[PDB]
């Protein structure tokens, strides 16, 4: 059994809410909680756009700017309003900061930069879905491991991001 995000062409595990381009019609057989996309490029594109919507916000709930990996991941993976106190959001931010080789409170973060967005998207995909080797698949030689470099690039291109090339 593949992870839910990969089965759904929704490797970010985006919850139903916005009618992203490339969604399947929702039916009685649909995933009850998470978006299902017709192709991986559409799911990857939606993930890049969601992260851009957070980054483009001036201020977070806590009153602080949204201009750092910590503040972007706080929006992406928010804690619950009540129930058991748990620090999954802090661990998630630290893990993505390691993927970017940046400190979580570095305010030079630019998610309009192709390479920065690529590393954050790929980090989230690998975090949400685990190792392809755990599902008896060969990982691709990249951060995300589930999708080819070409599949990641097509998602990001569709989200408007420009990789400088020679
Ligand atoms: Cl790059």
Author numbering: 4 to 169
Report text from the authors:
Further experimentation revealed that a truncated variant of the ORF39 protein containing only the conserved PHA02564 domain can be readily produced in a soluble form and without adverse effects to the cells. This C-terminal deletion variant of the protein, ORF39ΔC, was therefore used for the subsequent studies. During subsequent crystal soaking and co-crystallization experiments with substrate analogs a different crystal form was discovered that diffracted to 1.6 Å. No electron density corresponding to the bound substrate could be identified in this structure, but due to the higher resolution and better resolved protein loops it was selected for reporting here. The crystallographic asymmetric unit contains two protein molecules which are represented as chains A and B in the final model. The two molecules have an interface area of 591 Å2 which due to its small size likely does not represent a biologically relevant assembly. Apart from three N-terminal residues that were poorly structured, the A monomer could otherwise be modeled without gaps whereas the model of the B monomer does not include residues 83–89 due to disorder. The overall structure of the ORF39 EAD is all-helical and consists of six α helices (α1 to α6) and a single one-turn 310 helix in-between α5 and α6. The structure can be regarded as two overlapping helical bundles, the first of which is formed by α2, α3, α4 and α5 in a roughly antiparallel arrangement, and the second consisting of α2, α5 and α6 with α2 and α6 running parallel to each other. The overall shape of the EAD is roughly globular with a large groove between loops connecting α1–α2 and α3–α4 and centered on the C-terminal end of helix α3. The Glu131 in the ORF39 EAD corresponds to the catalytic glutamate residues in the superimposed TM0633, gp144 and MltC proteins which suggests that the groove is indeed the active site of the Enc34 endolysin.
